[PDB]
Amino acid sequence: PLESQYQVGPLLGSGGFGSVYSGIRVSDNLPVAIKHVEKDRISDWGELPNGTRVPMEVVLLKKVSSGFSGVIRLLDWFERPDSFVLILERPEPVQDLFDFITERGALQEELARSFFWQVLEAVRHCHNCGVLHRDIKDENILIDLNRGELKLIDFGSGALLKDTVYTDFDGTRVYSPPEWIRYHRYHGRSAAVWSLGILLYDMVCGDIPFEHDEEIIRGQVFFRQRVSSECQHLIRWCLALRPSDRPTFEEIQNHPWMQDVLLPQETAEIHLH
Numbered sequence: 001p002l003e004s005q006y007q008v009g010p011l012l013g014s015g016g017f018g019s020v021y022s023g024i025r026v027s028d029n030l031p032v033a034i035k036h037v038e039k040d041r042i043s044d045w046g047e048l049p050n051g052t053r054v055p056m057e058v059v060l061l062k063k064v065s066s067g068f069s070g071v072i073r074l075l076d077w078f079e080r081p082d083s084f085v086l087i088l089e090r091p092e093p094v095q096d097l098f099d100f101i102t103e104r105g106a107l108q109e110e111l112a113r114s115f116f117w118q119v120l121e122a123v124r125h126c127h128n129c130g131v132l133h134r135d136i137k138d139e140n141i142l143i144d145l146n147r148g149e150l151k152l153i154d155f156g157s158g159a160l161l162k163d164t165v166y167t168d169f170d171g172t173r174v175y176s177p178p179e180w181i182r183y184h185r186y187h188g189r190s191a192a193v194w195s196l197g198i199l200l201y202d203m204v205c206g207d208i209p210f211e212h213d214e215e216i217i218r219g220q221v222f223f224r225q226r227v228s229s230e231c232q233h234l235i236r237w238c239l240a241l242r243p244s245d246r247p248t249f250e251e252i253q254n255h256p257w258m259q260d261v262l263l264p265q266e267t268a269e270i271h272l273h
């Protein structure tokens with residue numbers, strides 16, 4: 001079933017998330033990504049309408065599946081004796097935002113605006129669908145280089161969105177908020193906004209603002225690169241120490257820095273082609 005349907009290519013990456021390979025669907029040559037996750041390494045388990053036990057990642061991906069292109073599409077999944085295999089869409093050509101920033105260094109603000117806006121729209125979509133990603137970062141954002149469209153990947157640390165406190169966390173520590181570091185407690189939306197602040201800083205400075213717990217806890221943001229006052233203000237707002245002092249998604253998108261965003265295709269023409 002699986003081995004007949006797909007031609008496996010090189011390894012794209014491995015780590016805490018598992019192992020992910022490039023591949024091709026034999027029937028129609030469709031580019032895909034093939035993600036393997038060992039059962040023992042899965043703590044978060046969900047359940048389909050069937051009653052079938054699957055990784056929460058599959059549940060979340062199904063919940064966010066639609067025409068909306070800002071989230072990676074799950075094409076299929078398979079259970080093996082000791083692992084699960086996910087077949088995902090693969091844009092081509094594509095580059096993840098981490099590599100993109102490594103190559104380019106600090107992004108021009110017009111480009112960071114387009115990218116950040118698309119990330120916000122994607123994250124809003126997830127939340128509307130009842131899904132919290134919990135690992136928003138440059139490494140988990142794909143750039144469709146022809147269309148100038150960004151997509152969220154790796155819902156392996158995510159969870160169902162709830163209004164009560166989370167006391168578990170398996171995402172990336174340097175993107176995690178001060179309330180997690182200090183109290184091992186956070187709420188979904190305000191934690192997401194913190195991680196978005198980290199992301200935005202990363203885009204416009206070419207590196208993350210905090211390395212150590214004490215930096216995160218203190219929350220003093222220093223700019224190493226030239227960044228506009230409007231952008232600095234939004235970043236500092238997202239990175240408010242008190243969760244309730246952070247902006248809502250609406251307030252982020254209504255912020256002066258976020259106005260007159262380019263269309264994805266405009267973005268590709270100007271910055272990517």
Ligand SMILES: N[C@H]1CCCN(c2ccncc2Nc2ncc3ccc(-c4c(F)cccc4F)nn23)C1
Nearest residue numbers: 012013017020033088089090094095096139153154
């Ligand atoms: N920073 C990326 C490196 C590649 C693997 N990666 C992932 C980690 C956890 N889950 C999934 C992924 N990757 C993933 N899921 C679907 C896709 C689709 C495309 C890609 C991809 C990519 F992320 C980089 C370069 C080429 C690619 F095809 N990765 N990808 C993080």
